[model samples]
Target: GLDVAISQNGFFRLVDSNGSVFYSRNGQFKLDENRNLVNMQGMQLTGYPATGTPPTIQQGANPAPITIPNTLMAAKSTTTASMQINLNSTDPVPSKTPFSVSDADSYNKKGTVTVYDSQGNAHDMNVYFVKTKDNEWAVYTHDSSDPAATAPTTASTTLKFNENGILESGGTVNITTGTINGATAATFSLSFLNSMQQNTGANNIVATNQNGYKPGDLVSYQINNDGTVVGNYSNEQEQVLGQIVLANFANNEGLASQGDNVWAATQASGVALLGTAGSGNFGKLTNGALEAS
Candidate 1:
């Protein structure tokens, strides 16, 4: 009676068979065989993936039984798939202009879902589009085995597509070089294939502004809200590749979901909101795009 999973940035886990890595708001877990850490009835769960290092619980010596080897799950497939970061709106203007969608379409336009690539493989990207000029699109990455291979770094923003498509701002776009080390952030799904205007019944066909869709590998990577993680990439060259460092806590939900999803602060989930996904409100990193429950 335990099949838990949590990971919206709040890991947690539980799934039983031999699986018992309780302690969770439920983040989700499954990865054994030396990779250690399991739960899904396969038990063997402790903790490790803390980054910067900080996970070692071995007192009496009995918590060691994680095994996931069907030959590494048959060599593991699904290199990259899962993305949806569409922001499209052609009406209601209140432009203070900062690329304003009038507050993200009144409440965050549309952001489909799914993520996890780079060999871990898992794709399904779908992002509507918007933004057609100001600086052209920007946000590139490379290293999911070689997504076009050519981005050691990137992070860009120069939008300015108005005429109804929406978006304005000819500034803020800096991500010097690649491999995006520390604090990283980037999220864009621009698409104005020429503002779509076709009606050829009497004459009405004006579509001439292409080159706005490219991003799909290097999936799953989040941690902003002002912590930073941003690493979304599929290609078309939307790379940023690195930057996932978050851990905040002043007393968040009282943290302690040591399952598979992951969350451990005890005093509360308030001390693990670290930083570097996009910095500030922590939001940026859109590889095909996924996070639309």
Candidate 2:
């Protein structure tokens, strides 16, 4: 009789070149030459990178592979911020000048951002990009608390685009947070690195996201509640490094066996519902499992 090892209803799934995700009761894994987590079949593990900052997951039509850098992961401070927005190419530029902050109907799009001060303190800043001409806009900043009161327009920076929609004025606006509420950030730069004016069939500016983070080094790691593989940093911080993918089939009993403690999904088993651990009807994790032959 052959003996086998597994973690009781362990968090297990194998990804392969054929893209067939296999579900098993085994928790077998190890580091590859590249320092990436891989299965016994040499399939590389997949998930998000762990920075000293919070992490998020994105799902797509085809699943993706995860990799960890073999070198030391460095800490970074957000130097510049950016985004991509779809602005109406046909929207008429507002006639005349002296744009009013209280008049929202006059501006094309207003965006907001949270920035950190030199002392690691966070501050809030709002920017308004108003369509003032044929392919040109005026940028301004206004700060009004949630309930809305003083609501003052603080800056006069302007942004203009070329005839082809490329930012002619360099597409940059500088903002300053000088002692507000309690925090103070001298000043920083902002740019629409990919800002565009296109006929996207929409009248709004869509911001993909901005980037910046604190610094830390890997100290330790553990499986998160949602099954994300996270690492703790020496700087006393925990970040998501990657996700552990667990696959569940509609008919678990119908999966085809591939021997060696592996089972492949088939029509009888239906398609596998791929997700992180600890969710749905899947089983719980174990430090060790029951014996089998």
Candidate 3:
């Protein structure tokens, strides 16, 4: 069940078909046609809505029907790409002089990173490392979609390691895939920090990370322990869609039952004390589950 259940005593604020407000201990829930979270009887689940460019939950505002956004996650261009690689020191310098993108023999080893442009287009950034001296290496870059003979417009800093096999300087470089495949040029800084040139057996990439993502559609949403409705996207990004608010009563046994596991506020039960989940005495929520009858 795609529902949310409270761990302890709490009730979900729901609105019936006739606009009557009710409270329910039942956690069985689902999304309606317009994306509103509702119970089996089609009662809308009320909660604090999120707003702004980067959705922010209105914690202090009144709670309303929760609606999940059904939009695509925006694309972001590459800004920084960091890599930790171990360049073997024992490897001999290339026989060929002067770096050439077309000749693989010109470079000792190559590392590739996927970069995105303004239009969310992916371009392979191939970085070639060439050993020039015992502890000195030259770096060059080429776009996979570019001509084989295209000059190394996005050149990298020459790396120079100390006697201890630790990088001293030239561990960072600027890369620019100029107007690749109609997408705007992707400019970013390539970091080689924590890289080494030891008598290591092989040259391999230890880890790599980039700060860009392609556009993605919303996959699904689930409630977190704190009762926040999180929208998961295909791009591996998440957005805070909304929050599930809980209501408590001063006199729990004094509430009037309208059946269907719902209760209506009455003079004896006092007013519904609305609060966000996991706050005060309200219990946290568990997603993808329902409470037993």
Candidate 4:
């Protein structure tokens, strides 16, 4: 059974299979060569509290050496890519076209995001949506070789919507060598006919076309002060993961340190503030392939 004990220094320690004790400031731990939970110094660690039952170790036969599974450490990919392009316009005088990519020469942005696929193989794909014409976009990829492919292929995916912004997928496109071949690019245009009609208080924006890609993996998490948990994936897309609940008290510093970098709630820690991550002033989460130092 798992057992926990507090030492005189207010730190915590765990007992191992051989009854040896180990201490840690943080609760994080792993089993050692002898199948015993230990701190960085190979000291046996404890579990739970003194009153709670400790983890149980089977006696008699020596169990196989415990090893942490590698699956937990697999790396995820990012979604955003970087690219550059030159916008060409016949007239130096800019026209007031409602929808124009004419400013391609002066527009460029870099960032990351998460992309999904039909088969759920989420990959980090970087995108550079550069304006090359009043109506054309020079798309490029930065992070992966696909972006730099000589005479790279492209697909025309249109975003169709009613006046209300409801998305409708007319179809998808697969381009090779910068051409859609049999398919035309105009088929991927967005329609505002229905959007003007459904101009309610809410904005109805939908994604009519999907870039063929796979589902992304979990990368990282960001915690908000208000208790929101945001997750970042290698795909470059940020998503809401969960929330963190913090306990408040009149005098939080009065709480006792139970070792393992954990503090036991005392009269000072106050009542536990439990709520969803996005709920109040909680922070947002950002997921990514890179780990934080």
Candidate 5:
């Protein structure tokens, strides 16, 4: 779907054929071959580009022709993972002395998370929780690809919970994943600060989170109700491309009609007052909907 939007009480500013400014009430919008937001007349829609390191729409910034950036997002390696889990306190200790991947009875429960390497290759990190004794647990990690190998990649990390079922220590474990497929080795910290030991009869992971990203390409766009033009990427990331600005005139009737849904400013119309949607007297835009006026 195209990024279409409508203003209830303002006009969309566009660059006319002769480099002059024109106003339009038509909501039909799309990206042209040059990546500029354009109307049916092919006039470039004007707005403000996001600025700053993290990129944000700065107030009072000069406006320009809005264009979605046709760029690639860089890949990022995972350095940390957060797991919130509930370890069943009622589970019994393993009958086997040594933990083995071949023996499911050695561990009480297991959870798996995908972590990315330097080259953006995804690898599954399987974690097993073994109830060693009352209020104590041992965490083991292994590669899902090499289940036959009984040797886990990381050493056993101890987890201790107090009598009140609150985590006492060992909330953080450093994991070392050896080099794989020419990618750099991964050394990351696994955090379990929100984990707890409770008699829930079953161990289950509450939530899991990791920060790693592969290269992404801008795929589609959506103009939000707040006039935010968001670019959706292939990597499931949403980036703010720009903001659609609205222009207001003191006398709407004074605007000279230039046909094709466009109007020109006049001495009677006064100067254009530019502002973001939903601020002050400016009306918020509606995406995918056209204004009756």
Candidate 6:
């Protein structure tokens, strides 16, 4: 689909090989041979470079054509994983007196997760749930290196439910007490964000998501409403690549177009009011084929 761009301050600035700059309402751009943001006229799009943790755009310096190298990217360890699952109310009760992980005797319901370390190593994590009451369940995690352990080395979190079977408490579970896959102090957070224990007449998980990944390769990208350029990786990960910088003029219509959909700064246009998108008159990004009213 064609991307659209509409802003209170609209227009993308372009630069030709001659070092001459121009501005226009065009937002569609394709990469050149060297992976630069170039237009149909081969003019490169200008924007501030993105860097730092969580990604930050550095301004003040002159904007340049953005380039994303075609290479493998480093993997990010899983910091959090969430699941929205339903526990069947019709499931059988545990046969063991107390919940056993190794013996696998009791426990009404069970779940599992895949955690990753800083080095992109994978590990298995087991979560066992035991019904202690009609509306409450005792949750436990196996701390052993083996995924088939019987009992956990820590206390259980009591998951309480309301009369309607909607989860009322004990949704977050943190695992920092043990190691996973030979990793030390494998710190992570697990959450059942919007899960329910309903009488669906069946036992099955609804959906699950995690924030960990192995090494990935640069694949695709898109601009956000906040003007941030995000890159998609092969490992199903996303990172802030950079942000576009818009240069607004006091006299936008008075600016001269030097052909190829570029606008040259004229004496009537004044100096380019360079700033990050959404700052001052510069506006937010809305991707499409054209900027709209």
Best by lDDT: 3
* Alpha carbon lDDT of each predicted model: 0.31, 0.56, 0.82, 0.32, 0.77, 0.69
Question: TM-scores of the models, in the given order?
Answer: 0.19, 0.45, 0.80, 0.28, 0.76, 0.61
Model 5's C-alpha root-mean-square deviation from the true structure amounts to 4.6
Local error of candidate 3 at 267, Å?
5.3
Model 1, stretches more than 4 Å misplaced?
1-69, 74-94, 100-102, 105-108, 119-293
Error (Å) of candidate 4 at residue 261 is 6.3
The root-mean-square deviation over C-alpha atoms between each candidate and the true structure, in angstroms, is: 20.9, 14.3, 4.1, 14.9, 4.6, 6.4
Better of 5 and 6 by TM-score: 5
Residue range 191-221, candidate 1, lDDT tens digits: 3233221211211223222122332444333
**On a 0 to 1 TM-score scale, where does candidate 1 land against the true structure?**
0.19
- Per model, state how many residue pairs clash: 97, 5, 0, 57, 0, 11
**Over the stretch 1-293, how does candidate 2's per-residue lDDT look in tens digits?**
11123332432666676765666665556656665656677765554344333455544324445654434334333356554555777876665345566677767677777654544444445667777667766677654332342444444555666767776664666655545445344366677766777754555556634343334556555554455555566545555556656666778788888876678888898887766555655444433222110
- lDDT score at residue 92, model 5, on the 0-100 scale: 92
Query: Tens digits of per-residue lDDT for model 6 on 14-120?
Result: 78898787887776676557867777778877777877765667875568877655656676677887767677776666767666776566776667777666766
Order of the predicted models by TM-score, top scorer first: 3, 5, 6, 2, 4, 1
Is candidate 3 or 4 superior in lDDT? 3
lDDT of 3 by residue, 1-293 (tens): 46667778789899877878899988877766788878888898888989875688998888888887687878788889988889998998999867787787888989899988888888788888999888998889877855433677444788999998899989888888757556677899999989998786799989888999888788767777888888888888878878888999999999999888899999999999888777897877754432211
Point to the candidate with the largest TM-score.
3
Q: For residues 1-293, could you state the per-residue lDDT of candidate 5 as single tens digits?
A: 15455557888888955778988877667666788877877788888888763467765777778878777655567899878889988899989868776689988888988887777677688888888789998899876643343476344588999988899999898876656676775678999888999966589999998888666787766777767777677788767778878888999899999889799899999988888778887778864422210
